[PDB]
C-alpha cells in the first residue's frame, strides 16, 4: 500500500508591521483553544498574535496564509478515496475541521485549522 | 444574536446625576469595546465615551473628570454614571457595540449592533 | 483634536441617479495595513443607524452593489449609483484610527425629489 501523508496547517492573518528598520517580517493572528480528552463539552477560544518572516510563512492563493511546514501525520493505503475517509475521521476525533485540499504529487491531504486545540 | 438595551435615562436637575445602563442580550460582549454616543433632536451624532474590555475608558474632553464610565461582564451589561450634569448634556444617548477591543489592526468589521437609545 | 467635515450638509436628488457625498478628515486614516479606518453609517426616520460601509470601501452585510465608496487618506466619497426611495435619510461618515476613540461628521441629509 501507499504512504499518505496529513498536514494539519493553522490559518494565520498575516499584516505588515506597524511603524517602527526591517521590513520583511509580519504580525500575524491565530486563534486557539485548550481542552480536556475525555470529558469534551470544549471551551472559550482565545485568540493571538505573532511574528514571523516571509520565509516561514506560504499562503493559499484568497489570502490565508499558513506555515511551511505543518504537523504532518500519515498513513497506509490502498488509493487515495479510502486515505479520504481515514484521515477525514481522524479529524473529526481529533477536532479538526477547514480547508481540505488534495496534493496528489505528493500523496498529502493538507487541512488548514483556523484554530489550535490542544490538551 | 446580540440586543443592546438602553435605560435610566430621565428629567434631572442641573448638577445632578443619573445612572444609565446598557443590557446586552443573545451573546457576551465582554471582550468588545462599547461606546456611548449621544444625539440632539433626532439629528447629528457625537461620539462621547469608550470603555475597553479591560476596564480601560476613554471620554472626551467636554465630560472629561465629570462623567465615569463602568460594566459588569457578570451582568454583561454597562454603566454610565454622571454628575454635576448641565443643559449641555442633554440629548439621547445610545450604547454600540465595537470591535473587540485591542485586535482593530487584524480585525475591524465595523460598528454593528446600536441600542435603543435612552433620552 | 481630530476633526470630520461632511459636504453637503443636505440633498435632493431624483430616483433613479446618483448621489455623491464627500466627508474630509484633517488627518490621514490610513494605518501600516494599508487600510484607510473610515466607516459610512445611515439613520434611516424612527430607526437607529445601521452601518453601510465599514474600512473606506467595502460594502457591509446586507448592502447591495448600488452603494459603493472610494477615496483614501484624508478625502473620502461616498456614491449612490441609483437613489431609490428607501434610501432617504442622514448620512454619517465616522474615523476609527484613534479607535477607541472616534468622531463624526456633521451629516449629510438626502432627501427624495418628485
Known amino acids: 500500500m501507499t504512504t499518505f501523508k496529513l498536514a494539519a496547517c493553522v490559518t494565520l492573518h498575516c499584516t505588515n508591521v506597524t511603524i517602527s528598520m526591517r521590513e520583511e517580517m509580519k504580525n500575524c493572528s491565530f486563534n486557539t483553544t485548550t481542552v480536556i480528552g475525555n470529558s469534551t463539552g470544549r471551551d472559550k477560544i482565545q485568540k493571538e498574535y505573532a511574528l514571523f518572516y516571509k520565509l516561514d510563512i506560504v499562503p493559499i492563493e484568497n489570502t490565508g496564509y499558513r506555515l511551511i511546514n505543518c504537523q504532518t501525520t500519515t498513513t497506509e493505503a490502498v488509493d487515495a478515496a479510502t486515505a479520504a475517509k481515514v484521515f477525514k475521521q481522524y479529524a473529526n476525533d481529533n477536532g479538526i475541521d477547514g480547508e481540505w485540499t488534495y496534493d496528489d504529487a505528493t500523496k498529502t491531504f493538507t487541512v488548514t485549522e483556523g484554530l489550535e486545540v490542544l490538551f | 444574536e446580540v440586543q443592546l438595551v438602553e435605560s435610566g435615562g430621565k428629567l434631572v436637575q442641573p448638577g445632578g446625576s443619573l445612572r444609565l445602563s446598557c443590557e446586552a442580550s443573545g451573546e457576551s460582549v465582554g471582550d468588545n469595546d462599547m461606546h456611548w454616543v449621544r444625539q440632539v433632536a433626532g439629528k447629528g451624532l457625537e461620539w462621547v465615551s469608550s470603555?475597553?474590555?479591560?476596564?480601560?475608558?476613554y471620554y472626551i474632553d467636554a465630560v472629561k473628570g465629570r462623567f465615569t464610565v463602568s460594566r459588569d461582564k457578570g451582568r454583561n451589561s454597562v454603566y454610565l454614571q454622571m454628575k454635576t450634569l448641565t443643559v449641555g448634556d442633554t440629548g439621547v444617548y445610545f450604547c454600540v457595540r465595537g470591535p473587540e477591543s485591542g485586535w482593530f489592526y487584524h480585525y475591524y468589521w465595523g460598528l454593528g449592533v446600536w441600542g435603543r437609545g435612552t433620552t | 483634536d481630530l476633526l470630520m467635515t461632511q459636504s453637503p450638509h443636505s440633498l435632493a436628488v431624483t430616483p433613479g441617479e446618483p448621489a455623491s457625498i464627500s466627508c474630509r478628515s484633517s488627518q490621514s486614516l490610513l494605518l501600516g495595513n494599508g487600510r484607510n479606518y473610515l466607516d459610512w453609517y445611515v439613520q434611516k426616520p424612527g430607526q437607529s443607524p445601521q452601518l453601510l460601509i465599514y474600512?473606506?470601501?467595502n460594502r457591509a452585510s446586507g448592502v447591495p452593489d448600488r452603494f459603493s465608496g472610494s477615496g483614501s487618506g484624508t478625502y473620502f466619497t461616498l456614491k449612490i449609483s441609483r437613489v431609490e426611495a428607501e434610501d432617504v435619510g442622514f448620512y454619517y461618515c465616522?474615523?476609527?484610527?484613534?479607535?477607541?476613540?472616534?468622531?463624526f461628521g456633521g451629516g449629510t441629509k438626502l432627501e427624495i425629489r418628485r
Open positions: 474600512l473606506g470601501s
Open positions: 465616522m474615523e476609527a484610527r484613534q479607535t477607541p476613540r472616534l468622531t
Open positions: 470603555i475597553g474590555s479591560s476596564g480601560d475608558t
